Every structure is written in structure tokens, then in C-alpha cells.
């Protein structure tokens, strides 16, 4: 049980009005970030007051960056004296089945991994505020991960526009837009630095062998419907080959004993395939409902299996 669960306990303070007590029992399966893996904490260490930096409240793009310095734990039972939570990073349960809750407006399917995201959506930033304790609580939003890779992709890309629309999504036919908000330029520089380091390291001497094959692609996307549906309407390679005719250096430095393309793929995966995890946080959780259905709808609990 010590190795199977790890019941981290947030202590509730003393003076709580029964409405503010009945609010926390409505937060049965939520997501709570722990700074350590202590077994004894308090709500002041969880709440938004522990989350604010020196003098400055973080924006939503920085609110990601101080999630990944912490420990996501799921509340499992709200006792009248304390809150029991189990961290994801160690190990979930004995049987390994935790109940989360879709705070999102987006349903889940079975086998979708679950990456969690701050309240980015419009009409959504719901913080349970305890007025008898003077504590707000930002409960983050579980999502299917191709939304959570695209939502973080909209926030970085909007941040580079301010160094000199984009805020509209679609998912399963549902139009949903996210909150357009001012951004801290200190935080966006960290995301900007993590692109330039990770994209340049994925460039190898074998990539110029690949860039010679760009006029093959535009010759090929005129034939396949697959590749014509692959590139995009908004691609760059369709523009950077009608202005650009590249060519390779004809011989390579010891190009027979070593493989110039194979090392380019491995270096690309270690820096660009990894890159969605570097900006956001990791999907450590997926959905395997047993006997209900393929789809857990919004507002309803979904069982959880550990997931690499």
C-alpha cells in the first residue's frame, strides 16, 4: 500500500462555513498540483496564493511552466477534516483505477491519453473560491491530447506576434475559441528559447539530402490525393520550392561507412518529435472505461489507467 498508493493528505483548516465546506465535496475528482510528495500539506500550499510568483501573477502561458515544476495529484476523497490525493507520478492505485472528471466541454474516447491544461477557454475560467479561508483554486482542465498539443501551439504562436484570427479551434465539429489575453514577455521568451534550441539540434548534414526531394513532393502531390491532402493549403514547402531549386553536395565526407539519412531521422525524433512534450506537460493518464461505453461525456467521471 505504501508502494501501491501514496495517499498524500492536504489538511483543511479550521474555520470553514458549511457552504465553503460543501464546495470542496463538489470537487471530488479534480487535479491538484503538489510541490513535494509529503504526506502532510495544507490548502495554502496548493492554492493560487502559493502559485503566484514574487509580486507578479503568472499568465496562462506561464501557468503551464509552473505546472511542470510540480506534482499532479488527483483528489480521491474529500474528508471533513482533510483532503486525500494520490500523485500520478509515482503510481496511481493498487488496482490502478482513479476517477477523474471532465471539466472540459470536450468528451473523451477510450484510449485517449489525457493531458491537462489551465482554464484557457472562454466562459470557462471557473475557480472555486473559499471566502472563509480566502483561497481561490484553479482546477485545470483534462483534455484529449491532440487538443492539448494544439492549444499550447496557439499560445506560443500568438506570443511571437507580439515581438513585432489565431485563437479559433475546431474539434469534432464543435467550434470553440480560447481566451485572448495579454502575455508576459518574460514567459514567452522561455518558450521561444525552447524552439530554437530544439529545432536547430534536429538539423543534421543528412537533412540537405532530404531538402533536394522537395521538388519530388510537389511533383507527387499533383498525383496522389493522399499527398495533396497532406501538405496543406497553408504549407510553406509549396512556397519554398517554387522560389527555390536546391541541390546537394555530390559526395560526402566518408559517406560510405556511415549512413547520412539514418542519423538525420534519429536526431530529428530526439528533438522535434519530443517537442510537443517540451512546451506543454506530459500525458501520464489515459481512459479505459470497463463496461460503459467508448465515450465519457463532459461533466462525468472517467476511469484512469497509468500511461507512459
Amino acid at each position: 500500500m505504501i508502494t501501491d498508493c501514496f495517499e498524500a493528505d492536504i489538511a483543511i483548516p479550521s474555520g470553514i462555513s458549511r457552504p465553503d465546506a460543501a464546495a470542496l465535496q463538489r470537487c471530488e475528482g479534480r487535479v491538484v498540483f503538489l510541490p513535494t510528495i509529503r504526506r502532510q500539506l495544507a490548502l495554502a500550499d496548493v492554492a493560487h496564493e502559493s502559485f503566484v510568483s514574487g509580486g507578479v501573477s503568472p499568465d496562462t502561458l506561464g501557468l503551464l511552466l509552473a505546472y511542470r515544476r510540480r506534482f499532479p495529484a488527483v483528489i480521491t476523497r474529500v474528508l471533513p477534516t482533510r483532503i486525500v490525493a494520490c500523485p500520478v507520478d509515482l503510481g496511481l492505485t493498487h488496482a490502478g483505477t482513479v476517477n477523474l472528471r471532465n471539466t472540459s466541454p470536450v468528451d473523451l474516447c477510450n484510449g485517449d491519453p489525457v493531458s491537462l491544461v489551465p482554464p484557457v477557454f472562454e466562459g470557462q475560467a471557473t475557480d472555486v473560491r473559499l471566502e472563509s479561508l480566502d483561497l481561490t483554486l484553479r482546477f485545470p482542465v483534462p483534455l484529449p491530447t491532440p487538443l492539448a498539443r494544439e492549444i499550447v501551439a496557439r499560445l506560443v504562436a500568438r506570443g511571437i506576434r507580439d515581438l513585432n484570427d489565431l485563437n479559433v479551434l475546431y474539434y469534432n465539429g464543435a467550434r470553440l475559441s480560447l481566451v485572448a489575453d495579454v502575455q508576459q514577455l518574460a514567459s514567452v521568451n522561455t518558450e521561444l528559447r525552447s524552439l530554437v534550441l530544439n529545432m536547430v539540434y534536429s538539423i543534421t548534414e543528412g537533412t540537405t539530402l532530404i531538402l533536394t526531394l522537395i521538388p519530388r513532393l510537389l511533383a507527387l502531390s499533383a498525383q496522389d490525393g493522399y499527398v495533396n491532402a497532406l501538405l496543406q493549403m497553408q504549407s510553406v514547402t509549396r512556397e519554398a520550392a517554387q522560389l527555390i531549386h536546391p541541390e546537394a553536395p555530390m559526395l560526402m565526407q566518408d559517406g560510405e561507412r556511415r549512413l547520412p539519412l539514418y542519423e538525420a531521422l534519429v536526431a530529428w525524433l530526439a528533438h522535434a518529435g519530443q517537442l510537443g512534450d517540451i512546451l506543454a506537460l506530459a500525458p501520464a493518464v489515459r481512459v479505459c472505461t470497463f463496461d460503459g461505453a467508448a465515450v465519457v461525456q463532459s461533466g462525468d467521471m472517467a476511469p484512469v489507467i497509468r500511461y507512459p
Binding site: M252, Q253, D254, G255, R257, R258, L259, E263
Partner: peptide, 11 residues
């Protein structure tokens, strides 16, 4: 060692 070596090293 003959393949993963960068060019200019002793395999």
C-alpha cells in the same frame, strides 16, 4: 563502431 562514428574518427 564502423557506422555510428562521425567522419574523421578511428573505427
Amino acid at each position: 563502431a564502423r557506422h555510428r562514428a562521425p567522419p574523421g574518427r578511428q573505427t
